[PDB]
RNA sequence: GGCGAAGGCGAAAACUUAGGCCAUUACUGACGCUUAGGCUUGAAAGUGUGGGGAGCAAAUAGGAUUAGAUACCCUAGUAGUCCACACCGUAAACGAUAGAUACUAGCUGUCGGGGCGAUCCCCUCGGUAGUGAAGUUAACACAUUAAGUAUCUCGCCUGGGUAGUACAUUCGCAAGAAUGAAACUCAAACGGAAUUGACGGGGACCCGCACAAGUGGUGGAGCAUGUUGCUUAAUUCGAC
């Protein structure tokens, strides 16, 4: 086992003034290169002003609010043919998983160029389509179906 | 066991009586030898005499 | 069509049944874990008994139900959830009682599984 | 907790009947203990005859699990499980401790009888438990209910496997029971107690990129390289 693990701090970006944007730029990073992902995300921002003219922060928070999952799933088995257990997860991991879903689903689509695909991903997340809201809805629907296990668990 | 006045004060004793009813009902639903009856009864009596004193 | 009545619940170790009855002995309606969609081994849960009791309380509400006796039957961990369902339902429960089919030490029961 | 010699005995009542406990100036006057042989009883299962048969449940069928399952689980399901009359006479029938007698520190209880006497307590005579001295014990442990101090009697034992088997004999409808070896073989044994470890699908507690979470890779392609096998002149030798 181990004890409780402290978390390293993440600094907000003082240009759009949101630390969730910093977690965006962190998760969408590959190879350990802030510059390339930074240009990608800022081009996506410029596209947000370009089509569907609206505050990028507003569509950002709307996408975060729609994609966030209400409940999580935890494995607690007894014997063969294991059974799941839905438990409660704090908001930090909830937004972390929402961002992870946005990142993974963005790089799974048509419109080959990253700029338009990630922009369409954030647009769909704001508008509640099957791109990512489908996954959250499914993971919610497996929850509260076997909630009898959730009530009596440990 | 009829006892209930307004809301809940009866319910605690209801849990007590339900526990003792379950205790008395479990040992009359599965068959095994009479010697086992006697030995388990003495074991339960010993538990009561050692824990509750 | 009656104010007073009695509703019976029998929480078996493998299932549960709830049944609302008039004082004349006739049944009004019954409910069980099988009435709901989920079946198989997962029906012996306190949550299932709770939702069954919720549904039976609902379907007796339109009947115009009032103060009612409560006879609880069977052994299991799901009988008390029906108590919570009925108490939270706002019904006029008045008396609780124990009606397990308890025998004196007579007929020989089945064995130890082993 | 109580009673019974043992097996056993617990919803209620009547009849018959057993033995038991305390004080007994009463009576009798050693009439006692043990008991080969003999006799009586003796859990469950099983046998014969007639009933009875709710539930349970050998055997049997089916559904699952498994590699197989003639098992563990589930659904049925026969004998039997119950009563009346006869038989079998075995059990871890154990306190694994034969019966009888007297003595030997103590303490805590509990139950029955007597007296004092609201129970509560006091003591007396007994049974039944726990703790514990010396003493005994290979050790564990026993210790006033001894496995101690001794006596009387009965029964029993003489390495293990063969084997509680064979032959004979008695009983029994039978199942079988009682009695009970040897040939051969081993140098020890499902020997006993206790000790250190080890192990446990035994518990209690605690760590670790162990689990959990995430990220990124190998098994998919091709090339580099090492290894296994084959080959030849060696494909030098080891690392497994």
Q: Is residue A102 part of a domain?
A: yes
CATH of the domain at A67: 1.10.455.10
Q: Burial level of A148, CB count in 10 A (0-12/13-18/19+)?
A: buried
- Asked whether C15 and C32 are in contact (CB, 8 A), the reply is yes
Strand partners, C29: C20
Q: Is residue A134 part of a domain?
A: yes
Strand partners, C5: C68
Cα(A71)–Cα(A141) distance, integer angstroms: 10
CA distances from C59 to B33, C8, C55 (A): 47, 15, 6
Q: Is residue A4 part of a domain?
A: no
What phi, psi does A13 have (nearest 5°)?
-90, 115
For chain D, which bases have at least one atom within 7 A of a protein Cβ? 9, 54-57, 72-74, 206-216
Expressed in angstroms, the distance from the first to the final Cα of chain B is 27
Q: Is residue A1 part of a domain?
A: no
3-state secondary structure C48-102: HHHHHHHHHHHHHHCCCCCCEEEEEECCCCCHHHHHHHHHHCCCCEEEEEECCCC
Give me A112's structure tokens.
């080959």
Number of domains in chain A: 1
CB contact under 8 A, C87 and B7: yes
What strands lie across the sheet with C16-21, from one edge to the other?
C27-32, C16-21, C5-11, C68-73, C93-98
Q: Burial level of A121, CB count in 10 A (0-12/13-18/19+)?
A: buried
Give me C99's structure tokens.
């009606």
- Asked whether C56 and C91 are in contact (CB, 8 A), the reply is no
CB contact under 8 A, A151 and C48: no
Residue C101 beta carbon within 7 A of nucleic strand D: no
Nearest nt to the CA of B38 via C1' is D10
Give me B45's structure tokens.
């009596």
Nearest nt to the CA of A97 via C1' is D214
Q: Is residue A3 part of a domain?
A: no
Cα(B23)–Cα(C39) distance, integer angstroms: 29
C111 at interface of B, judged by CB pairs closer than 8 A: yes
Supply the Cα-derived Rg of chain B in whole angstroms. Answer: 15
Q: Burial level of C95, CB count in 10 A (0-12/13-18/19+)?
A: middle
User: From the CA of A29, how many Å to the C1' of D221?
Assistant: 28
Which distant-in-sequence residues (6+ apart) come within 8 Å of B39 by Cβ?
A: none
| DSSP conformation letters of A61-106 | HHHHHHH--S-EEEE--SSSS--EEEE---HHHHHHHHHHHHHHHH
Find the domain containing A42 and state its range: 19-151
Work out the angle between the directed axes of helices A56-67 and A91-106 (0-180°, nearest 10). Answer: 110
Cα(C106)–Cα(C74) distance, integer angstroms: 19
Cα(C58)–Cα(C48) distance, integer angstroms: 15
Q: Is residue A90 part of a domain?
A: yes
> With the CA atoms of A62, A68, A70 and A74 taken in that order, what torsion angle do they form, in degrees rounded to the nearest 10?
180
- Asked whether A10 and A23 are in contact (CB, 8 A), the reply is yes
Give me A39's structure tokens.
């240009």
Q: How was this structure determined?
A: cryo-EM
Token look-up 């014997």 returns A79
CA angle A76, A82, A83 (to 5 degrees): 60
Cα(C18)–Cα(C40) distance, integer angstroms: 18
Cα(C13)–Cα(A69) distance, integer angstroms: 36
| DSSP conformation letters of C3-57 | SSEEEEEEE-SS-EEEEEE-TTS-EEEEEEGGGSS--GGGG-SHHHHHHHHHHHH
Give me C5's structure tokens.
């009545």
Cα(B9)–Cα(B16) distance, integer angstroms: 12
A105: left (phi over 0), alpha (psi -120 to 50) or beta: alpha
3-state secondary structure B1-53: CCCCCCCCHHHHHHHHHHHHHHHHHHCCCCECCHHHHHHHHHHHHHHHHHHCC
Q: Is residue A109 part of a domain?
A: yes
Nearest nt to the CA of C113 via C1' is D73
Q: Is residue A64 part of a domain?
A: yes
Which distant-in-sequence residues (6+ apart) come within 8 Å of C31 by Cβ?
A: C17, C18, C19, C52, C53, C55, C56, C59
Chains C and A touching, counted as 3 or more CB pairs less than 8 Å apart: yes
CA angle C68, C69, C72 (to 5 degrees): 130
The subunits that touch chain A, with at least 3 C-beta pairs less than 8 Å apart, are: C
């Amino acid at each position: 086992r181990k004890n409780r693990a402290p978390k390293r701090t993440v600094l907000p970006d003082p240009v759009f003034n949101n630390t969730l944007v910093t977690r965006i730029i962190n998760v969408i990073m590959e190879d350990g290169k802030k510059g390339l992902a930074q240009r990608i995300l800022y081009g996506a921002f410029d596209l947000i002003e370009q089509r569907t003219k609206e505050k990028p922060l507003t569509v950002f928070e709307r996408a975060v609010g729609n994609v966030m999952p209400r409940l999580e799933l935890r494995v607690r088995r007894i014997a063969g043919s294991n059974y799941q257990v839905p438990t409660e997860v704090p908001q930090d991991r909830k937004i972390a998983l929402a961002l992870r879903w946005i990142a993974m689903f963005a790089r799974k689509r048509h419109e080959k160029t990253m700029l338009e695909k990630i922009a369409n991903e954030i647009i769909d997340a704001s508008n509640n389509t099957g791109a990512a809201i489908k996954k959250k809805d499914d993971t919610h629907k497996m929850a509260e179906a076997n909630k009898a296990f959730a009530h009596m668990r440990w | 066991e009829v006892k209930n006045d307004d809301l809940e004060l009866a319910l605690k004793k209801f849990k007590r009586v339900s526990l003792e009813i379950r205790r008395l009902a479990q040992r009359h639903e599965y068959h095994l030898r009479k010697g086992m009856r006697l030995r388990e009864k003495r074991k339960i009596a010993q538990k009561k005499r050692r824990k509750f004193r | 069509n009656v104010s007073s009545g009695i509703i019976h619940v029998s929480c078996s170790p493998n299932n549960t049944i709830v049944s609302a009855s008039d004082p004349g002995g006739n049944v009004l309606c019954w409910a069980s874990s099988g009435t709901m969609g989920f079946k198989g081994s997962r029906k012996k849960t306190p949550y299932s008994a709770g939702i069954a009791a919720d549904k039976v309380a609902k379907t007796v509400k339109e009947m115009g139900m009032a103060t009612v006796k409560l006879f609880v039957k069977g052994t299991g961990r799901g009988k008390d959830t029906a108590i919570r369902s009925f108490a939270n339902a706002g019904l006029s429960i008045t008396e609780i009682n124990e009606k397990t089919p308890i025998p004196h030490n007579g007929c020989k029961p089945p064995k130890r599984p082993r």
